[PDB]
């Protein structure tokens, strides 16, 4: 499936000026648009070549939507202080993430519309797009207000309406990069440790999309508890990389094989030292 998501952050700067407000847009893991309140001339911007072809009206309206959102966030930052009985001298953060995950037939798989205050969950729209989950007492106030104003109905219209429709358009205009598939180039390194064993690390490089399975196997079995990994890491060029390692006994390396699966790999690779 694919996804269209918007990540928003507003950081209050008491003692400096207005809250730093920001919006970032992604279709899967590629950022394609951005809005920064601090920029000299705050207006939505392209972060991927394939969105640049959108007309000035697309850009003007998105810039207008982002500013309305900035105001809303400035206001909520003040309300919070009140809800949590906090001082107006400290800096606080308010995050918002909204988006939709959709299958090939364009059917909404999962919708999101959630907030966090100072890094902790505040309130989130439930999977049913009908009810809200409030993390605490302050959030209840908000939940009851939104329950009364029928907020979930309007927000659901976006996730099921515009989110989905614009997602297919983007995937289309940007298929060349967004739907591309780069196989992973792999290899394994060797390191004799001081505990008198060896660490074997399997690298998978320059692949895309992100999804990948890097695994170590011994006697055709997955060493699920012995592996040390690192979450898939990004690169400026849009590709990803990763490694999985395991510690093995001296002179027994040839018993271990690295197994890597990927969209760009007709069949799983199997490497050795």
């Amino acid at each position: 499936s694919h996804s269209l998501r918007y990540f928003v952050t507003a950081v209050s700067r008491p003692g400096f000026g207005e809250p730093r407000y920001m919006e970032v847009g992604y279709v899967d893991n590629t950022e394609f648009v951005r809005f920064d309140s601090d920029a000299e001339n705050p207006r939505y911007e392209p972060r991927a070549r394939w969105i640049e072809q959108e007309g000035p009206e697309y850009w003007e309206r998105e810039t207008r939507r982002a500013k309305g959102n900035e105001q809303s966030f400035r206001v909520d930052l003040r309300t919070a202080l009140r809800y949590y009985n906090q001082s107006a001298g400290g800096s606080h953060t308010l995050q918002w993430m909204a988006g939709c995950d959709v299958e090939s037939d364009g059917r909404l798989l999962r919708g999101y519309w959630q907030f966090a205050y100072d890094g902790c969950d505040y309130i989130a729209l439930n999977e049913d797009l009908k009810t809200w989950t409030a993390a605490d007492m302050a959030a209840q106030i908000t939940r009851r207000k939104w329950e009364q104003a029928g907020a979930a109905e309007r927000d659901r219209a976006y996730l099921e309406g515009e989110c989905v429709e614009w997602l297919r358009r983007y995937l289309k205009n940007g298929n060349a990069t967004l739907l591309r598939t780069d196989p992973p180039k792999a290899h394994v390194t060797h390191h004799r440790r001081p505990e008198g064993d060896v660490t074997l690390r399997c690298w998978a490089l320059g692949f895309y999309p992100a999804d990948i399975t890097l695994t170590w196997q011994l006697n055709g079995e997955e060493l699920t508890q012995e592996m040390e990994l690192v979450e898939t890491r990004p690169a400026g060029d849009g590709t990803f990389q990763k490694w999985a390692s395991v510690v093995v006994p001296l002179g027994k390396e040839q018993k271990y094989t690295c197994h890597v699966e990927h969209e760009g790999l007709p069949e799983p690779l199997t490497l050795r030292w």
Binding site: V33, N69, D76, D155, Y158
Partner: peptide, 9 residues
């Protein structure tokens, strides 16, 4: 396009 805030906290 992105989401719009239509309700205050």
């Amino acid at each position: 396009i992105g989401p719009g805030r239509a309700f205050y906290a």
